[PDB]
Coordinates of N, CA and C and ligand atoms in Angstrom, one line a residue:
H1 N 0.8 -1.2 0.0 CA 0.0 0.0 0.0 C 0.9 1.2 0.0
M2 N 0.8 2.0 -1.1 CA 1.4 3.3 -1.2 C 0.3 4.3 -1.0
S3 N 0.2 4.8 0.3 CA -0.9 5.7 0.6 C -0.2 6.9 1.4
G4 N -0.4 8.1 0.9 CA 0.0 9.3 1.6 C 1.5 9.5 1.5
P5 N 2.0 10.3 2.5 CA 3.4 10.7 2.4 C 4.4 9.6 2.5
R6 N 5.6 9.9 2.1 CA 6.7 8.9 2.1 C 7.0 8.5 3.6
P7 N 7.0 7.2 3.9 CA 7.3 6.7 5.2 C 8.7 7.0 5.6
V8 N 9.0 6.9 6.9 CA 10.3 7.1 7.4 C 10.7 5.8 8.1
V9 N 11.9 5.3 7.7 CA 12.5 4.1 8.4 C 13.7 4.6 9.2
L10 N 13.6 4.5 10.5 CA 14.7 4.8 11.4 C 15.3 3.5 12.0
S11 N 16.6 3.4 11.8 CA 17.3 2.2 12.3 C 18.6 2.7 13.0
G12 N 19.3 1.7 13.5 CA 20.6 2.0 14.2 C 20.7 0.9 15.3
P13 N 21.9 0.8 15.9 CA 22.2 -0.2 16.9 C 21.4 0.0 18.1
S14 N 21.3 -1.1 18.9 CA 20.6 -1.0 20.2 C 21.2 0.0 21.1
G15 N 20.4 0.9 21.7 CA 21.0 2.0 22.6 C 21.4 3.2 21.8
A16 N 21.2 3.3 20.5 CA 21.7 4.5 19.8 C 20.9 5.8 20.0
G17 N 19.6 5.6 20.5 CA 18.8 6.8 20.6 C 17.5 6.9 19.8
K18 N 17.2 5.7 19.1 CA 16.1 5.7 18.2 C 14.8 6.1 18.9
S19 N 14.5 5.4 20.1 CA 13.2 5.7 20.7 C 13.2 7.0 21.3
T20 N 14.3 7.5 21.9 CA 14.4 8.8 22.5 C 14.1 9.9 21.4
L21 N 14.7 9.8 20.2 CA 14.5 10.7 19.2 C 13.0 10.7 18.6
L22 N 12.5 9.5 18.4 CA 11.2 9.3 17.8 C 10.1 9.8 18.8
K23 N 10.3 9.6 20.1 CA 9.3 10.1 21.0 C 9.3 11.6 21.0
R24 N 10.5 12.3 20.8 CA 10.5 13.7 20.7 C 9.8 14.2 19.5
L25 N 10.0 13.5 18.4 CA 9.4 13.9 17.1 C 7.9 13.8 17.1
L26 N 7.4 12.7 17.7 CA 6.0 12.5 17.8 C 5.3 13.5 18.8
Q27 N 6.1 14.0 19.8 CA 5.6 15.0 20.7 C 5.4 16.3 19.9
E28 N 6.5 16.8 19.2 CA 6.5 18.1 18.6 C 5.6 18.1 17.4
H29 N 5.6 17.0 16.6 CA 4.8 17.0 15.4 C 3.8 15.9 15.4
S30 N 3.0 15.8 16.4 CA 2.0 14.8 16.6 C 0.9 14.9 15.5
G31 N 0.7 16.0 14.9 CA -0.3 16.1 13.9 C 0.1 15.6 12.5
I32 N 1.4 15.4 12.3 CA 1.8 15.0 10.9 C 2.5 13.6 10.9
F33 N 2.9 13.1 12.0 CA 3.6 11.8 12.1 C 2.7 10.8 12.9
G34 N 2.8 9.5 12.5 CA 2.2 8.4 13.3 C 3.2 7.3 13.4
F35 N 3.3 6.7 14.5 CA 4.3 5.6 14.8 C 3.7 4.3 14.5
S36 N 4.5 3.5 13.7 CA 4.1 2.1 13.5 C 4.3 1.3 14.7
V37 N 3.3 0.7 15.3 CA 3.5 -0.1 16.5 C 3.8 -1.5 16.2
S38 N 5.0 -1.9 16.3 CA 5.5 -3.2 16.0 C 5.0 -4.2 17.1
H39 N 5.1 -5.5 16.7 CA 4.9 -6.6 17.7 C 6.3 -7.1 18.1
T40 N 6.4 -7.5 19.4 CA 7.6 -8.1 19.9 C 7.3 -9.2 20.9
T41 N 8.2 -10.2 21.0 CA 8.1 -11.2 22.0 C 8.9 -10.8 23.2
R42 N 9.7 -9.8 23.2 CA 10.5 -9.4 24.4 C 9.5 -8.8 25.5
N43 N 10.0 -8.8 26.7 CA 9.2 -8.3 27.8 C 9.2 -6.8 27.8
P44 N 8.1 -6.2 28.3 CA 8.1 -4.7 28.4 C 9.1 -4.2 29.4
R45 N 9.6 -3.0 29.2 CA 10.4 -2.2 30.2 C 9.6 -1.3 30.9
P46 N 10.0 -0.8 32.1 CA 9.2 0.2 32.9 C 8.9 1.4 32.0
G47 N 7.6 1.7 32.0 CA 7.1 2.9 31.2 C 6.6 2.5 29.8
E48 N 6.9 1.3 29.3 CA 6.4 0.9 28.0 C 5.0 0.4 28.2
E49 N 4.2 0.7 27.1 CA 2.7 0.4 27.2 C 2.3 -0.4 25.9
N50 N 1.5 -1.4 26.2 CA 1.0 -2.3 25.1 C 0.1 -1.4 24.2
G51 N 0.4 -1.6 22.9 CA -0.4 -0.8 21.9 C 0.2 0.5 21.6
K52 N 1.2 1.0 22.4 CA 1.8 2.3 22.1 C 3.3 2.1 21.7
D53 N 4.1 1.5 22.6 CA 5.5 1.2 22.2 C 5.6 0.0 21.3
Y54 N 4.9 -1.1 21.7 CA 4.9 -2.3 21.0 C 3.5 -3.0 21.3
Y55 N 3.1 -3.9 20.5 CA 2.2 -5.0 21.0 C 3.1 -6.1 21.5
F56 N 3.1 -6.2 22.9 CA 3.9 -7.3 23.5 C 3.1 -8.6 23.5
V57 N 3.6 -9.6 22.8 CA 2.9 -10.8 22.6 C 3.8 -12.0 22.9
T58 N 3.2 -13.2 23.1 CA 4.0 -14.4 23.3 C 4.5 -14.9 21.9
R59 N 5.5 -15.7 22.0 CA 6.0 -16.4 20.7 C 4.8 -17.1 20.1
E60 N 3.9 -17.8 20.9 CA 2.8 -18.5 20.3 C 1.9 -17.6 19.5
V61 N 1.5 -16.5 20.1 CA 0.6 -15.6 19.4 C 1.3 -14.9 18.2
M62 N 2.6 -14.6 18.3 CA 3.2 -14.0 17.2 C 3.4 -15.0 16.1
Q63 N 3.6 -16.2 16.4 CA 3.7 -17.3 15.4 C 2.4 -17.5 14.7
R64 N 1.3 -17.4 15.4 CA 0.0 -17.6 14.9 C -0.3 -16.5 13.8
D65 N 0.1 -15.2 14.2 CA -0.1 -14.1 13.3 C 0.8 -14.1 12.1
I66 N 2.1 -14.6 12.3 CA 3.0 -14.8 11.2 C 2.4 -15.8 10.2
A67 N 2.0 -16.9 10.7 CA 1.5 -18.0 9.8 C 0.3 -17.5 9.0
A68 N -0.5 -16.6 9.6 CA -1.7 -16.1 8.9 C -1.4 -15.1 7.8
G69 N -0.1 -14.7 7.7 CA 0.3 -13.7 6.7 C 0.1 -12.2 7.2
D70 N 0.1 -12.0 8.5 CA -0.3 -10.7 9.1 C 0.9 -9.7 9.0
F71 N 2.1 -10.1 8.7 CA 3.2 -9.2 8.8 C 3.8 -8.8 7.5
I72 N 4.2 -7.5 7.4 CA 5.0 -7.0 6.3 C 6.4 -7.6 6.4
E73 N 6.9 -7.7 7.6 CA 8.3 -8.2 7.8 C 8.4 -8.6 9.3
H74 N 9.4 -9.4 9.6 CA 9.7 -9.7 10.9 C 11.2 -10.2 11.0
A75 N 11.7 -10.1 12.2 CA 13.1 -10.5 12.3 C 13.4 -11.0 13.7
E76 N 14.5 -11.8 13.9 CA 15.0 -12.2 15.2 C 16.1 -11.2 15.5
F77 N 16.0 -10.6 16.7 CA 17.1 -9.7 17.2 C 17.4 -10.0 18.6
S78 N 18.6 -10.3 18.9 CA 19.2 -10.5 20.2 C 18.2 -11.4 21.1
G79 N 17.8 -12.5 20.5 CA 17.0 -13.5 21.2 C 15.5 -13.4 21.2
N80 N 15.0 -12.3 20.6 CA 13.5 -12.1 20.6 C 13.0 -11.9 19.2
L81 N 11.7 -12.0 19.0 CA 11.1 -11.7 17.7 C 10.5 -10.3 17.6
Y82 N 10.6 -9.7 16.5 CA 10.0 -8.3 16.3 C 9.4 -8.3 14.9
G83 N 8.4 -7.5 14.7 CA 7.8 -7.4 13.3 C 6.8 -6.3 13.1
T84 N 6.7 -5.9 11.9 CA 5.8 -4.8 11.5 C 4.6 -5.5 10.9
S85 N 3.4 -5.4 11.6 CA 2.2 -6.0 11.0 C 1.7 -5.1 9.9
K86 N 0.9 -5.7 9.0 CA 0.3 -4.9 8.0 C -0.6 -3.9 8.6
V87 N -1.4 -4.2 9.6 CA -2.3 -3.2 10.2 C -1.6 -2.1 10.9
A88 N -0.4 -2.3 11.4 CA 0.3 -1.3 12.1 C 0.6 -0.1 11.1
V89 N 0.9 -0.4 9.9 CA 1.2 0.6 8.9 C -0.1 1.2 8.4
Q90 N -1.1 0.3 8.1 CA -2.4 0.7 7.6 C -3.0 1.7 8.5
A91 N -2.9 1.5 9.8 CA -3.6 2.5 10.7 C -3.0 3.9 10.6
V92 N -1.7 4.0 10.3 CA -1.2 5.4 10.2 C -1.5 5.9 8.8
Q93 N -1.3 5.1 7.8 CA -1.6 5.6 6.4 C -3.1 6.0 6.3
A94 N -4.0 5.3 6.9 CA -5.4 5.7 6.9 C -5.7 7.1 7.4
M95 N -4.8 7.5 8.4 CA -5.0 8.9 8.9 C -4.2 9.9 8.0
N96 N -3.6 9.5 6.9 CA -2.9 10.4 6.0 C -1.7 11.0 6.8
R97 N -1.1 10.3 7.7 CA 0.1 10.8 8.4 C 1.3 10.1 7.9
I98 N 2.5 10.7 8.1 CA 3.7 10.1 7.8 C 4.0 9.0 8.7
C99 N 4.2 7.8 8.2 CA 4.4 6.6 9.0 C 5.8 6.5 9.4
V100 N 6.1 6.4 10.7 CA 7.5 6.2 11.1 C 7.7 4.8 11.7
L101 N 8.7 4.1 11.1 CA 9.0 2.8 11.6 C 10.4 2.8 12.2
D102 N 10.5 2.1 13.4 CA 11.8 1.9 14.0 C 12.1 0.4 13.9
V103 N 13.1 0.0 13.1 CA 13.4 -1.4 12.9 C 14.9 -1.6 12.8
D104 N 15.3 -2.8 13.0 CA 16.7 -3.1 12.9 C 17.2 -3.2 11.4
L105 N 18.5 -3.5 11.2 CA 19.1 -3.6 9.9 C 18.4 -4.6 9.0
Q106 N 18.1 -5.8 9.6 CA 17.3 -6.8 8.9 C 16.0 -6.2 8.4
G107 N 15.3 -5.5 9.3 CA 14.1 -4.9 8.9 C 14.2 -3.8 7.7
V108 N 15.3 -3.1 7.8 CA 15.6 -2.1 6.7 C 15.7 -2.9 5.4
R109 N 16.4 -4.0 5.3 CA 16.6 -4.8 4.1 C 15.2 -5.4 3.7
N110 N 14.5 -5.9 4.7 CA 13.1 -6.4 4.4 C 12.3 -5.3 3.7
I111 N 12.3 -4.1 4.3 CA 11.4 -3.1 3.8 C 11.9 -2.6 2.4
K112 N 13.2 -2.7 2.1 CA 13.7 -2.3 0.8 C 13.0 -3.2 -0.3
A113 N 12.6 -4.4 0.1 CA 12.0 -5.3 -0.9 C 10.5 -5.1 -1.0
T114 N 9.9 -4.2 -0.3 CA 8.5 -3.9 -0.4 C 8.2 -2.7 -1.3
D115 N 7.0 -2.2 -1.4 CA 6.6 -1.1 -2.2 C 6.5 0.2 -1.4
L116 N 7.0 0.3 -0.2 CA 6.8 1.4 0.7 C 7.5 2.7 0.3
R117 N 8.7 2.6 -0.4 CA 9.5 3.7 -0.7 C 9.8 4.7 0.4
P118 N 10.3 4.3 1.5 CA 10.6 5.2 2.6 C 11.9 6.0 2.4
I119 N 12.2 7.0 3.2 CA 13.5 7.5 3.5 C 14.1 6.6 4.6
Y120 N 15.4 6.3 4.5 CA 16.0 5.4 5.4 C 17.0 6.2 6.2
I121 N 16.9 6.3 7.5 CA 17.8 7.1 8.4 C 18.4 6.1 9.4
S122 N 19.7 6.2 9.6 CA 20.4 5.5 10.6 C 20.9 6.4 11.7
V123 N 20.6 6.1 13.0 CA 21.1 6.8 14.1 C 22.2 5.9 14.8
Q124 N 23.3 6.5 15.0 CA 24.5 5.8 15.4 C 25.1 6.5 16.6
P125 N 25.7 5.7 17.5 CA 26.5 6.3 18.6 C 27.8 6.9 18.1
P126 N 28.4 7.8 18.9 CA 29.8 8.2 18.6 C 30.8 7.1 18.6
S127 N 30.6 6.1 19.4 CA 31.5 5.0 19.5 C 30.8 3.8 20.1
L128 N 31.4 2.6 20.0 CA 30.9 1.5 20.7 C 31.1 1.6 22.2
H129 N 32.2 2.2 22.6 CA 32.3 2.4 24.1 C 31.2 3.2 24.6
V130 N 30.8 4.3 23.9 CA 29.7 5.2 24.4 C 28.4 4.4 24.3
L131 N 28.2 3.7 23.2 CA 27.0 2.8 23.2 C 26.9 1.9 24.4
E132 N 28.0 1.2 24.7 CA 27.9 0.3 25.8 C 27.6 1.0 27.1
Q133 N 28.3 2.2 27.3 CA 28.0 3.0 28.5 C 26.5 3.3 28.6
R134 N 25.9 3.7 27.5 CA 24.5 4.1 27.5 C 23.6 2.9 27.7
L135 N 23.9 1.8 27.1 CA 23.2 0.5 27.3 C 23.2 0.1 28.8
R136 N 24.5 0.1 29.4 CA 24.6 -0.4 30.7 C 24.0 0.6 31.7
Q137 N 24.0 1.9 31.4 CA 23.3 2.8 32.3 C 21.8 2.6 32.3
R138 N 21.2 2.3 31.1 CA 19.8 1.9 31.0 C 19.6 0.6 31.8
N139 N 20.4 -0.4 31.5 CA 20.4 -1.7 32.1 C 19.0 -2.3 32.2
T140 N 18.2 -2.2 31.1 CA 16.9 -2.9 31.0 C 17.0 -4.3 30.5
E141 N 18.2 -4.8 30.2 CA 18.5 -6.1 29.6 C 19.4 -6.9 30.5
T142 N 19.3 -8.2 30.5 CA 20.2 -9.1 31.2 C 21.6 -9.0 30.5
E143 N 22.6 -9.5 31.2 CA 23.9 -9.5 30.7 C 24.0 -10.2 29.4
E144 N 23.4 -11.4 29.2 CA 23.4 -12.1 28.0 C 22.8 -11.3 26.8
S145 N 21.7 -10.6 27.1 CA 21.1 -9.8 26.1 C 22.0 -8.6 25.7
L146 N 22.7 -8.0 26.7 CA 23.6 -6.9 26.4 C 24.7 -7.4 25.5
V147 N 25.3 -8.5 25.8 CA 26.4 -9.1 25.0 C 25.9 -9.3 23.5
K148 N 24.7 -9.8 23.4 CA 24.1 -10.0 22.0 C 23.9 -8.6 21.3
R149 N 23.4 -7.6 22.1 CA 23.1 -6.3 21.5 C 24.4 -5.6 21.1
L150 N 25.5 -5.8 21.9 CA 26.7 -5.1 21.6 C 27.4 -5.8 20.3
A151 N 27.2 -7.1 20.2 CA 27.7 -7.8 19.0 C 27.0 -7.3 17.7
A152 N 25.6 -7.3 17.9 CA 24.8 -6.8 16.7 C 25.2 -5.4 16.4
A153 N 25.5 -4.5 17.4 CA 25.8 -3.1 17.1 C 27.1 -3.0 16.3
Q154 N 28.1 -3.8 16.6 CA 29.4 -3.7 15.9 C 29.2 -4.2 14.5
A155 N 28.5 -5.3 14.3 CA 28.2 -5.8 13.0 C 27.4 -4.9 12.1
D156 N 26.3 -4.4 12.7 CA 25.4 -3.6 11.9 C 25.9 -2.2 11.6
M157 N 26.8 -1.7 12.5 CA 27.4 -0.4 12.2 C 28.3 -0.4 11.0
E158 N 29.1 -1.5 10.9 CA 29.9 -1.7 9.7 C 29.0 -1.9 8.5
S159 N 28.0 -2.7 8.6 CA 27.1 -2.9 7.4 C 26.4 -1.7 6.9
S160 N 26.1 -0.8 7.8 CA 25.4 0.5 7.5 C 26.2 1.5 6.7
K161 N 27.5 1.2 6.5 CA 28.3 2.1 5.7 C 28.1 1.7 4.2
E162 N 27.3 0.7 3.9 CA 27.0 0.3 2.6 C 26.4 1.5 1.8
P163 N 27.0 1.8 0.6 CA 26.5 2.9 -0.2 C 25.0 2.7 -0.6
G164 N 24.2 3.8 -0.6 CA 22.8 3.7 -1.0 C 21.9 3.0 0.0
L165 N 22.4 2.4 1.1 CA 21.6 1.8 2.1 C 20.8 2.8 2.9
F166 N 21.5 3.7 3.5 CA 20.8 4.8 4.3 C 20.9 6.1 3.6
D167 N 19.8 6.8 3.5 CA 19.9 8.1 2.9 C 20.6 9.1 3.8
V168 N 20.5 9.0 5.1 CA 21.1 9.9 6.1 C 21.7 9.1 7.2
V169 N 22.9 9.4 7.7 CA 23.4 8.8 8.9 C 23.6 10.0 9.9
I170 N 23.0 9.8 11.1 CA 23.1 10.8 12.2 C 23.8 10.2 13.3
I171 N 24.9 10.9 13.8 CA 25.6 10.5 15.0 C 25.0 11.2 16.2
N172 N 24.5 10.4 17.1 CA 23.8 10.9 18.3 C 24.9 11.1 19.4
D173 N 25.6 12.1 19.2 CA 26.5 12.6 20.4 C 25.7 13.4 21.3
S174 N 25.1 14.5 20.9 CA 24.2 15.4 21.6 C 22.8 15.2 21.1
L175 N 21.8 15.0 22.0 CA 20.5 14.6 21.6 C 19.8 15.8 20.9
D176 N 20.0 17.0 21.4 CA 19.5 18.2 20.7 C 20.0 18.3 19.3
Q177 N 21.2 18.0 19.1 CA 21.8 18.1 17.7 C 21.3 17.0 16.8
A178 N 21.3 15.7 17.3 CA 20.7 14.6 16.6 C 19.2 14.9 16.2
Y179 N 18.5 15.5 17.1 CA 17.1 15.7 16.8 C 16.9 16.8 15.7
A180 N 17.7 17.8 15.7 CA 17.7 18.8 14.7 C 18.0 18.2 13.3
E181 N 19.0 17.2 13.3 CA 19.4 16.6 12.1 C 18.3 15.6 11.6
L182 N 17.6 15.0 12.5 CA 16.4 14.2 12.1 C 15.4 15.1 11.4
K183 N 15.1 16.2 12.0 CA 14.1 17.1 11.4 C 14.6 17.7 10.0
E184 N 15.9 17.9 10.0 CA 16.6 18.4 8.7 C 16.3 17.4 7.6
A185 N 16.5 16.1 7.9 CA 16.3 15.0 6.9 C 14.9 15.0 6.4
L186 N 13.9 15.4 7.3 CA 12.5 15.3 7.0 C 11.9 16.7 6.7
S187 N 12.8 17.7 6.5 CA 12.3 19.1 6.5 C 11.3 19.3 5.4
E188 N 11.6 18.8 4.2 CA 10.7 19.1 3.1 C 9.4 18.4 3.2
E189 N 9.5 17.1 3.8 CA 8.2 16.4 4.0 C 7.4 17.0 5.1
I190 N 8.1 17.6 6.1 CA 7.3 18.3 7.2 C 6.6 19.5 6.7
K191 N 7.3 20.2 5.8 CA 6.7 21.4 5.2 C 5.5 21.1 4.4
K192 N 5.6 20.0 3.6 CA 4.5 19.6 2.7 C 3.3 19.1 3.6
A193 N 3.6 18.3 4.6 CA 2.5 17.9 5.5 C 1.8 19.0 6.2
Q194 N 2.5 20.1 6.4 CA 1.9 21.3 7.0 C 1.1 22.1 6.0
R195 N 1.2 21.7 4.7 CA 0.5 22.4 3.7 C -0.6 21.6 3.1
Ligands
LIG1 N1 22.8 11.9 23.2 C1 22.7 11.1 24.3 N2 23.6 11.2 25.3 C2 23.5 10.4 26.4 N3 22.6 9.4 26.5 C3 21.6 9.2 25.6 C4 21.6 10.1 24.4 N4 20.6 9.7 23.6 C5 20.0 8.7 24.3 N5 20.6 8.4 25.4 C6 20.2 7.4 26.4 O1 20.7 6.1 25.9 C7 19.8 5.1 26.2 C8 19.4 4.5 24.9 O2 18.5 5.3 24.2 P1 17.2 4.7 23.5 O3 16.5 5.8 22.9 O4 16.5 3.9 24.6 O5 17.9 3.7 22.5 P2 17.2 2.8 21.3 O6 15.8 3.1 21.3 O7 18.0 3.3 20.1 O8 17.6 1.4 21.6 C9 18.7 5.7 26.9 O9 19.0 5.6 28.3 C10 18.8 7.2 26.6 O10 18.3 8.0 27.7
LIG2 N1 12.9 -5.9 11.8 C1 12.3 -5.3 12.8 N2 13.0 -4.8 13.8 C2 12.4 -4.1 14.9 C3 11.0 -4.0 14.8 N3 10.6 -3.3 16.0 C4 11.8 -3.0 16.7 N4 12.8 -3.6 16.0 C5 14.2 -3.5 16.3 O1 14.7 -4.4 17.3 C6 15.8 -3.8 17.9 C7 15.7 -4.0 19.4 O2 14.6 -3.2 19.9 P1 14.4 -2.8 21.4 O3 14.4 -4.2 22.1 O4 15.7 -2.0 21.8 O5 13.1 -2.1 21.6 C8 16.0 -2.4 17.4 O6 16.9 -2.3 16.4 C9 14.6 -2.1 16.9 O7 14.6 -1.1 15.9 C10 10.3 -4.5 13.8 O8 9.0 -4.4 13.7 N5 10.9 -5.1 12.8
LIG3 F1 15.2 0.3 20.5 AL1 16.5 -0.5 21.6 F2 17.8 -1.0 22.6 F3 15.6 0.2 22.9 F4 17.3 -1.0 20.1
LIG4 MG1 14.3 1.8 21.9

């Protein structure tokens, strides 16, 4: 379904700032953006809400919906399942809002194979040391999950240098600066949606 404005795919390693930046964008520009609410089998973190951050489901329920053809894409990431349901994107497109998706690098490649034609943005830390610091400060994951996330970060940061893969790469050193660069990448779309 190609409906409405060009969607936005935001990716980057675990801990890079994706959710922090997207929450800011949806607060400032609530009238023109809508968030695709993915399914995940991971457990919710304090403050996360079902139907807002994710649909938190069991492996059994997610497998039922996968088998029925309910997903545009799905991926295994650091021991859990994640995916973008068809209805998650339809809900935002039906409101004629810019659909924002937060997905991993596998999801980026999955979406490249669809008809969605998004802009692809990668948010990256200044270094893997800083990434680990931010992840361990958050400490919402077990040690095993952190190890998996740090390994995925190193692999996916190298893979994201692929030419033509990402339209924009933003280094999240300072959040205020990264957020301005996020809006810069979307500035013409934001202006059109306001008109
Ligand atoms: N520029 C920054 N400087 C320091 N800490 C940050 C910055 N941006 C985000 N963080 C923190 O890093 C952690 C990871 O950010 P988050 O948005 O949860 O990552 P993601 O959603 O990409 O996995 C959070 O604790 C967040 O508060
Ligand atoms: N492929 C895919 N990845 C997702 C989806 N939802 C979240 N992710 C990704 O899974 C990783 C872990 O998410 P987190 O557990 O930190 O919320 C992040 O890279 C995030 O973007 C999804 O629907 N599809
Ligand atoms: F979106 Al995450 F660690 F919170 F990749
Ligand atoms: Mg997040």
